Amino acid sequence: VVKRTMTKKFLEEAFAGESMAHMRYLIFAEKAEQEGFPNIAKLFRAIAYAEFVHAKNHFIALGKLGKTPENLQMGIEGETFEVEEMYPVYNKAAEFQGEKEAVRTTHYALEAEKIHAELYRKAKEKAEKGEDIEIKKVYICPICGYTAVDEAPEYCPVCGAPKEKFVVFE
Amino acid sequence: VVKRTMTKKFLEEAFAGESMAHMRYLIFAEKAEQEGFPNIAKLFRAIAYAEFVHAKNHFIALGKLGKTPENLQMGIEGETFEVEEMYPVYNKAAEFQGEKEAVRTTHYALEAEKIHAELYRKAKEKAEKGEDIEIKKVYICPICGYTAVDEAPEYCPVCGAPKEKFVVFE
Numbered sequence: 528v529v530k531r532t533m534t535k536k537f538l539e540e541a542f543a544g545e546s547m548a549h550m551r552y553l554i555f556a557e558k559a560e561q562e563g564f565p566n567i568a569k570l571f572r573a574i575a576y577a578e579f580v581h582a583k584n585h586f587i588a589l590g591k592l593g594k595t596p597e598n599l600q601m602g603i604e605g606e607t608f609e610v611e612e613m614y615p616v617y618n619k620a621a622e623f624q625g626e627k628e629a630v631r632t633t634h635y636a637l638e639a640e641k642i643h644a645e646l647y648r649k650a651k652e653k654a655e656k657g658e659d660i661e662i663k664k665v666y667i668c669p670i671c672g673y674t675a676v677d678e679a680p681e682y683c684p685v686c687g688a689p690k691e692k693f694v695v696f697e
Numbered sequence: 698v699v700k701r702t703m704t705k706k707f708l709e710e711a712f713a714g715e716s717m718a719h720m721r722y723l724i725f726a727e728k729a730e731q732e733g734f735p736n737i738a739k740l741f742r743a744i745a746y747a748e749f750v751h752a753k754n755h756f757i758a759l760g761k762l763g764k765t766p767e768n769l770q771m772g773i774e775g776e777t778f779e780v781e782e783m784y785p786v787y788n789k790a791a792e793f794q795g796e797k798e799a800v801r802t803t804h805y806a807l808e809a810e811k812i813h814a815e816l817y818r819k820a821k822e823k824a825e826k827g828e829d830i831e832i833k834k835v836y837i838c839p840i841c842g843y844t845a846v847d848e849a850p851e852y853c854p855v856c857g858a859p860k861e862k863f864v865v866f867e
């Protein structure tokens with residue numbers, strides 16, 4: 528596990544940079560598919576996986592990967608920070624500054640992170656007893672990221688989208 | 698497109714935080730699968746897609762998404778920054794500090810980013826003339842992120858993993 532302060536800081540910066548490159552590449556893949564370039568989309572999705580590999584390597588060098596219950600707890604802490612601190616503040620600043628698209632994107636994320644934090648708390652209670660959770664399907668809204676388990680709502684309560692547009696993970 | 702300086706800075710921070718949450722959840726899904734929690738792994742992958750929606754929404758509110766050739770150009774400039782500036786300095790700092798694990802993760806990423814820069818350069822030449830690239834498959838080394846289009850060596854030239862272990866996008 529890396530211990531020296533400067534190299535630790537640089538691998539945390541590199542983990543952010545790799546995670547952003549991967550994310551930009553998944554967003555560009557979808558745009559290339561929409562524009563009629565399916566092979567460039569394939570190239571972006573494949574290079575996004577290579578950046579997952581680099582990010583995972585820095586993450587494990589920093590000692591941040593544990594077992595499932597401890598990884599759930601990292602998710603609980605992150606999501607609870609976003610719910611209680613980061614997105615309420617960014618949303619209020621965007622409203623104060625009149626930036627309506629940012630009010631919308633922070634509101635979309637904040638309503639979904641409240642659900643994420645509770646789903647991870649429920650999962651950790653099972654994994655702490657050595658049990659997997661009992662969920663068949665997870666539905667995610669492609670507009671806002673609202674998240675629901677086992678049945679999609681008739682429409683998304685955050686953006687209005689109909690049940691039929693949810694993306695299903697089974 | 699967001700224009701006020703503080704809201705833009707907060708949506709850039711939120712894009713990085715969403716990107717890192719998505720990356721953590723992909724890393725945790727693989728670990729949950731390894732440990733015998735398939736339904737928790739499914740939950741982490743579905744929530745990772747929700748954080749891709751959140752990140753994409755902030756990135757579009759920032760005005761950073763364009764057409765395919767301009768997205769490839771963002772890719773060329775980001776890869777070239779990692780190749781010429783960021784990873785050579787982080788790898789020399791880790792060497793100077795004795796942090797062998799960080800020398801390794803930065804060396805793995807730098808050798809792959811040299812390839813990703815040239816692949817995006819070749820793809821943008823095509824996309825600028827309205828052509829897709831012609832590729833059948835892309836191979837990614839799951840240890841180091843070495844990347845090869847259509848033909849790959851029998852062993853990764855960076856870490857020596859056998860081609861049977863490469864992840865294939867086709």
Ligand SMILES: [Fe+2]
Nearest residue numbers: 545578581806
């Ligand atoms: Fe990378």
Ligand SMILES: [Fe+2]
Nearest residue numbers: 606639640643
């Ligand atoms: Fe979340």
Ligand SMILES: [Fe+2]
Nearest residue numbers: 668671683686
């Ligand atoms: Fe929605």
Ligand SMILES: [Fe+2]
Nearest residue numbers: 636715748751
């Ligand atoms: Fe999120």
Ligand SMILES: [Fe+2]
Nearest residue numbers: 776809810813
């Ligand atoms: Fe790269």
Ligand SMILES: [Fe+2]
Nearest residue numbers: 838841853856
């Ligand atoms: Fe490799």
